Design a protein around this nucleic acid. Structure first.
Lengths: 188, 189
DNA sequence: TATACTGTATATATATACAGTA
DNA sequence: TATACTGTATATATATACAGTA
C-alpha cells in the first residue's frame, strides 16, 4: 500500500527533522512545520504511516518514531562447474558502482588476485568492452573471465597458465552478459 | 579535557541507543540501562559531557542529546590518516579495525596485489603461519609470520621474492595487526 | 468506513532543579 | 570546586484519547 500525497510529505518531514536535529519530531513539531493547527492531524497521519508499514510508533515514548547492503546472489564459475545473503558494503566504493556480489568458484583468475572463495563485486550491465573482466552466462552457467568478442566468436580468457580460454559461438550457444567485475572482497 | 571511564560509557551508550532505536535516550533510560537508581546521576553525567564538548544538550527538548567506517591509514610494503571507507568491520573474523593500501607484489600467490586495500585487526597476539602486518624500523610490511625465538622470518607468497629475516636483538620489531581480509576497488579496463 | 484536518483535554513521560553523601 | 552517585520534587513537554467538520 503506497503513501498518499500528504502522507509522503509527513514521512519526508520526519526524515528531514532527524537529519537536521538528530532526533525524531514531536507531534507538535510535525504540526508546526507542516502548518497544522492541531497536533492530532500529525498523530493520525503517523498512525496511517504505521498502518502502511513505513514507520514504527513506540507507544508512550516521546519522539517515538522509527523509520523502517550488497546482495550475494550465488556463485560464479572460474573454471569449476556451477540469492543467499546480504553484506553491508558501500556500493559507491567501486567505479562504476557495484550492484551485487558473486562468490568465485575456481582458480582461473588466479594471476590477477581473484581466488577461489572470493566475493566478486559486479556492476549490473550488458555494455562491456573487450579486455574487461566480465561476468558472462553460458547455457545457465555463470562464468567470470576476460572478454574478447569478435562477432559470432566470443573468447573468454582466463588469468592462469594452466587454464585454457573458453571459445563460445553464439550461433549454437546461449550467451548473456550479466555484468562487469568492478572489485573483489575476501573475508575467508 | 579527556573523558573519565564512566563518562565514556555514557557516551558509548547514547551512540548505541541512537544506532538501535533511532532516537537519543532519556535521563531515565540511561539510568536504567547503566544501573543507576536516580535519573539525576545520568543528568550530571550529560552535563559533564557537555562541558567537555562531546555532546550538546537541547534545553527543554525531550531526548535532546546531540552527539558532536573503516579508516585507510597509509600504505603497507609488499616488496617495494589518509581516507575513510564505509565497510562493515564485523564482516571479517576477527573484526577489522583499519585498512592499509598494499604496495608491492610479494603476496601475489594468495591474491594480495599492488593497490589492494588490506583489512587489518589491531592485535599483537599472532601465531606462526598467519598473514601479519609488522613494522621493521619505521617500515610497515605485510608477510606470513614465522617466529623462532630471536630469529623472526617474514615469508612472502611469491617465488621471485626472498624472505625477510629479522633479528630482535638488533632490529626494531612491532606487530601492527593481523591481516583478516582484502578489498579491491580499482577501475581497470 | 477512509483521508485530512480543527480544537480541547489529560495522564504521564521527561528534564531538571535542589538537597544530600562519599 | 570536581566525580559519582541516591532520593525527592515538579513544571512542562509530549502522546494520545475524544468530539467535531468537510
Amino acid at each position: 500500500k503506497a503513501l498518499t500525497a500528504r502522507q509522503q510529505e509527513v514521512f519526508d518531514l520526519i526524515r528531514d527533522h532527524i537529519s537536521q536535529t538528530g532526533m525524531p519530531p514531536t507531534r507538535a513539531e510535525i504540526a508546526q512545520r507542516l502548518g497544522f493547527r492541531s497536533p492530532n492531524a500529525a498523530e493520525e497521519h503517523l498512525k496511517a504511516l504505521a498502518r502502511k508499514g513505513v514507520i514504527e510508533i513506540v507507544s508512550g515514548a516521546s519522539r517515538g518514531i522509527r523509520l523502517l547492503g550488497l546482495p550475494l546472489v550465488g556463485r560464479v564459475a572460474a573454471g569449476e562447474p556451477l540469492i543467499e545473503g546480504h553484506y553491508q558494503v558501500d556500493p559507491s566504493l567501486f567505479k562504476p558502482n557495484a550492484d551485487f556480489l558473486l562468490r568465485v568458484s575456481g582458480m582461473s583468475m588466479k594471476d590477477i588476485g581473484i581466488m577461489d572463495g572470493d566475493l566478486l563485486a559486479v556492476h549490473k550491465t550488458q555494455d562491456v568492452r573487450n579486455g574487461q573482466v566480465v561476468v558472462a552466462r553460458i547455457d545457465d552457467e555463470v562464468t567470470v573471465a576476460r572478454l574478447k568478442k569478435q562477432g559470432n566468436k566470443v573468447e573468454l580468457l582466463p588469468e592462469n597458465s594452466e587454464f585454457k580460454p573458453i571459445v563460445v559461438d553464439l550461433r549454437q550457444q546461449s550467451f548473456t552478459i550479466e555484468g562487469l567485475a568492478v572489485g573483489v572482497i575476501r573475508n575467508g
